[PDB]
């Protein structure tokens, strides 16, 4: 039973037909980055809600973040559904690092996954993602799709737990405005 | 002679101290071209790199002490005749990302100082390079990539004969490094924002110049098909509605020779231009003495009936916007003995008795 508002921030569409090979995409949960594996033609977008505006500019962070992962979602007969979603939390993209959390989803049509993780570092509890200092790193959400013809897209929604604190400013480049493809909104329709 | 070497006091892990001279450690120079413009970056490097090639009493202390509890003090020394002036800003940022914006809106945010060389002989501030702790080190600022920027906010009112140079004096002081941390309590006594409301320009003339700055400060600053944002501002945009006492820092960015009386008041977008009854609103008359360059404005709780939105839809017009605006109005007339426009910097320092309401789902654009 959801209460407080989650905000959408990262979406990624699997490659268009006839791409049917198993694929994957990595979400940088703090920097707001979407990196598809290899050269697969993923269609990715990042939105600009307050949460992302904070995550992308706050140098130091500390606290709990709640994440909702939504999986869409295509006109597929339930009986013929065979798409699976594997997701992993990681502290790096190095093979030597192990998964911090694993979830497996195999619901037909669409799916919803709620989970949370903590950001905590050495600076009196604060962490500065990917800084050389103390080898601090960000958090990655790796999503694997076994059937990109049934699975159309991933949606990451985020929420700051009241214990979330920030400090310091990062000089970011201008943030491009949002601005379709698949009819999942009245506006798109 | 031999002795108990392990009992020697060679483990002096205490901070940098002594006379102010003893606590100096580096000096840098900023070339101020006689022909520069607003938004013109003057200096842009890493804070750590300041120590390269330096030979001062605490240079080696600074670079070897593993923990410092004091603050970094920086003093700018420079001047120009009263017949001119300009606006320089020095700011410390925690880090950067590729092709970062150099617009003052994002630079100022964290920690900074602003002064006009045509009135101040020098200017200084202290800061904590570790925004969420009470201690720091040279190695920490080196690997955390702390950045420093000097930028020309406003160009010269009257160009100096030759290029001039501002000099920065870097030293350590015994002021305790208190942290500056933002959090989600709905009620906060002091929420610092350092938000660059904007650069106002009032050309010389006898016209009725009116400027509007929205108090719906969330969403960042506009640009082309993009926007600028910094942490303090995006943090307050987390709430849907808010209220509190507003504390603004107003800076005379043009020379003393350019003068104008400016009225400040809180009203709404329904208030039109050329309405010669602006003083019917409760307001403040701000005049600048030739020495004076900075004025604090205070808008207490009594200036607002209710809270107001942190964001508005960018398509919203003034005639359909019930959020309050800060008006800056030329009470008399902008003039002087020399050519040049009157630039007036407006920065929201922070909010006292901050009350945040609800939760903002967010709007992609700003204004």
Residue numbers in the entry:
A (entry chain A): 6 to 184, 188 to 197
B (entry chain B): 1 to 367
Per the authors:
Cowpea mosaic virus (CPMV) is a plant-infecting member of the order Picornavirales, with a relatively simple, non-enveloped capsid that has been extensively studied. Crystallographic structures are available for three Comoviruses: CPMV, BPMV and red clover mottle virus. Together, the L and S subunits comprise three β-barrel domains (two from L, one from S) each of which contains a ‘jelly roll’ topology.
Here we show high resolution cryo-EM structures of CPMV-M and CPMV-T to 3.9 Å and 4.2 Å respectively. The second major point of interest in the previous cryo-EM structures of CPMV, was the presence of additional density representing part of the 24 amino acid, C terminal extension to the S subunit in the eVLP structure. However, the eVLP retains the C terminal segment better than WT CPMV particles that contain RNA (CPMV-B/M), suggesting an allosteric effect of genomic RNA in accelerating polypeptide backbone cleavage.
